Amino acid sequence: GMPTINSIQTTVNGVVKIVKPFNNDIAGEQFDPHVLQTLTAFKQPAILENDLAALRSGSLTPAIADPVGDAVTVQSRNITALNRTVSVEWLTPQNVINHTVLVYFHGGAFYGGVPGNNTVLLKLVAAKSHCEILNVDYSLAPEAPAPAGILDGLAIFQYLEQRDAETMITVAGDSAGANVIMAATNLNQQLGSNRINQQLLLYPVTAPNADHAGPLWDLAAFPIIDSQRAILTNYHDLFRQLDSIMTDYYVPENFDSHSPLISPLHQENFTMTPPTTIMVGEFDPFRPQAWAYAQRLAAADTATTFIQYQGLNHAFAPLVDQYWQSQDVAQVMAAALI
Amino acid sequence: QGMPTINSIQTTVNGVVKIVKPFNNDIAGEQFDPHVLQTLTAFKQPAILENDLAALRSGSLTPAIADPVGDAVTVQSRNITALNRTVSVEWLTPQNVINHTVLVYFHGGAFYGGVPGNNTVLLKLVAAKSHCEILNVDYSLAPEAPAPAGILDGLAIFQYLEQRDAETMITVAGDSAGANVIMAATNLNQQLGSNRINQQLLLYPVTAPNADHAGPLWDLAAFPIIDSQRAILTNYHDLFRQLDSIMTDYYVPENFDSHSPLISPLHQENFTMTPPTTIMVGEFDPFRPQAWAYAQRLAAADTATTFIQYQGLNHAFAPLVDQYWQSQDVAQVMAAALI
């Protein structure tokens, strides 16, 4: 039982923009009530400790209620290509359709997270689209910093393309995992592969460690009602802190975060970039850089859709038992695969 | 991350700080957390316990639990030796460890079973957050090494730690039967004159093995639940009633007795030396009333006692950090108690 929401669709700078309010009374500029009750801790400022283990301690999502169940099979397997062995959580639905396949990289600030954090979301997508999904357990920083994760993605692609010559690969991911797979896709294209025909990006980090006094990190871009403004400020400030810390773990000394393969926003050219759908919450600190990315695509004549979920924050999509918007993401993804 | 703020209720009952944590803000009690309930489908019918040491052992092995920390906490096997006992320890060391505070943990497994690996991820979370080093102890298992072998393994550990470092304060912890063994070893440590153990963190402890099953600590009337889940609860509680008898039979050799202070810490004569204690236990854990009885005996001896009750939860949930938010809360509480 999902709500009937009146979404607003416009076209800004070539980008098809779809703004989805959390209900039909409030059009924007406040948190969804469901979201707000999770942000209580943000009434006081947070000081993020640069401690890798403590940080990872908060990257494990406890099991989400699974309405799909045995309708989709979830099994682990290793695949090997380019002398890399990558573990994937492989999802197979009933009546699987051919050629179309989805590759997903989980979020977790480059250094953390687990594939299990979005298993249920993907089960919904696989059950609805009848497509197989690779929920990839990609290399994590700082033990395997950039471009290890990128190369795992490239191995996955090479595997998929050699397995089947008619495969159409959709790449997806949330947050920092979306960043990693965007770069792997770029790399795959610079070697001459055209099998990736679509990107589904959930609140991606497109410019890690961007200027925090710059336009992509300006709180003036997030108007909100008075009673929720201290929370937003402290929330946004936590991610500001995370953005610095996570990029430090991800990028080794010999590399630079402002490079095209670390910051996809800074690619010199976006014309080979596949058709992309981006889904992000109104109050996600990574929203402006995601939008900037979208505009860069559209200017390169690549079809781009930007869905904004009003009242939502970061990392909401796997939480399909908490937000209708999460179920809507699952539907948008499935619809993009059929 | 995205966890709706739970509104807990703190009261003081007979000196015990009681903190009740509902499984969500809608239901205050008297039913299973749905995440737990989905694991209890088989208890719609009476359970069949295979009374056989190999089956009992393998049934006390937890399948793999998702580990988000990885190498950020170092895990290695070490043997220590003291009192002419060699004890195997899974040693967890975080990067940048704080001095003088160390956690000794004993895994559950009904005295005859379990392995330290059952709760390794849980303890990585604790080490990660508290920067404390942790001894996850492979203590002697019944019946090959029944009471008081495990207790003495505990005593050997403490001496090792106290002779290693004169300033290092010890926090003892365990779950289920494992908590029982380390509670007794602590008691023993104190009767020999040591005061380096300054805290207990007990996860659903067995405080009175093989208590009267027709008595007040085993009365199903202490567990109000909605009609649709009464059968499941009854069969679940009943499984443990039977298990309580069996495990205690394995643990206690014929020359000893389960109702003794060192087998049943609830029946200690005196709790004045007992360290400040936090207890974490589910609403529907069959060992909840005996844990509460213990907490009250503590407070009556004027020992600081906190009793955290997780509504809707059953037994042995804490290691399962990829299954329940309560399991991670336990880690947070444990880590908070160590810093």
| Alpha-carbon distance B251 to nearest alpha carbon in chain A (angstroms) | 34
Cβ A125 vs Cβ A328: under 8 Å: no
B73 touches chain A (CB under 8 A): yes
Interface contact flag, A61 B1, Cβ < 8 Å: yes
Phi, psi of A323 (to 5 degrees): -130, 135
A231 shares contact with chain B (CB less than 8 Å): no
Q: Do B69 and A53 touch (CB under 8 A)?
A: yes
The identity of residue B23, as a single letter, is F
Report CA-CA distances (Å) from A221 to A65, B304, B325. Answer: 35, 50, 34
Is the CB of A57 inside 8 Å of chain B's CB atoms?
yes
Name B202's Cβ contacts closer than 8 Å, sequence gap at least 6.
B173, B174, B179, B183, B277, B278, B279, B280, B291
Contact (Cβ atoms closer than 8 angstroms) between residue B140 and residue B81: no
Map tokens 């509670």 to a residue: B183
Query: Helix or strand or coil: residue B329?
Result: helix
Q: How far is A12 from chain B (nearest CA, A)?
A: 31
Which residue of A57, A65, A319 is in closest CB contact with B2?
A319
Contact yes or no for A280/A325 (Cβ under 8 A):
no
Residue extents of the structural domains in chain A: 1-338
Statement: B1-339 belongs to CATH 3.30.230.10? no
Q: Which residues of B touch A52 (CB under 8 A)?
A: 72, 95
Considering only CB atoms, B95 lies closest to which of A52, A57, A319, namely A52
Query: Which among A63, A65, A316 is the nearest to B2, CB-wise?
Result: A316
DSSP secondary structure, B13-57, as one string: ETTEEEEEE-SSSS--SSS--HHHHTT-GGGGS-------HHHHH
Q: Which residues of A37-62 are buried (b: 16+ CB within 10 A; e: fewer)?
A: ebbeebeeeeebeebbbbbbbbbbbb
Resolution of this entry in Å? 2.7
Nearest residue on chain B to A59, alpha-carbon basis = B68
Which residues of chain A have a CB within 8 Å of the CB of B331?
57
CA–CA gap between residue A219 and residue B92 (Å, rounded): 41
Q: Give A50's contacts in chain B (Cβ within 8 Å).
A: none
Q: Which two tokens stand for residue A81?
A: 């290509």
From CA A172, how far away is CA A204, in angstroms rounded? Answer: 10
Of A20, A78, A111, the residue nearest A332 (C-alpha)? A20
Q: Taking the C-alpha atoms of A265, A269, A273 and A278 in order, what is their torsion angle to the nearest 10 degrees?
A: 30
Instruction: Report the alpha-carbon distance of residue B142 to residue B248 in Å, rounded.
Output: 9
Give me the residue from B72, B321, B323 closest to A53, CB to CB.
B72
Calculate how close chain A gets to B96, using CA atoms only, in Å: 9
CB of A60 less than 8 A from some CB of B: yes
Helix (H) or strand (E) run with residue B280 in it: strand B277-282
3-class SS of residue B279: strand
Q: Solved how?
A: X-ray
**What is the rounded distance in angstroms from the CA atom of residue B65 to the CA atom of residue A166?**
37
Residues of B in contact with A59 (CB under 8 A): 1, 68
Residues 297-326 of B with CB under 8 A from A: 321-325
The answer, for B132 touching chain A at a CB cutoff of 8 Å, is no
Q: What gap in Å lies between CA B15 and CA B27, rounded to an integer?
A: 27
Is the CB of residue A63 less than 8 Å away from at least one CB of chain B? yes
Cα distance between residue A74 and residue A63, in whole Å: 14
* A116 part of contact set with chain B, CB < 8 Å: yes
Copy the structure tokens of residue B282: 């589910």
CATH topology assigned to domain A1-338: Rossmann fold (3.40.50)
Q: Which residue of B has its CA nearest to A63?
A: B323
The per-residue DSSP string of A109-173 comes to TTT---GGGGHHHHHHHHHHH--EEEEEE---TTTS-TTHHHHHHHHHHHHHHHH-TT-EEEEEE
| B26 touches A at CB < 8 Å | no
A34 CA to chain B: closest CA distance, Å? 8
Type of residue at A207:
A
- Give the pair of three-digit tokens for residue A320: 């399909």
Strand partners, B75: B92
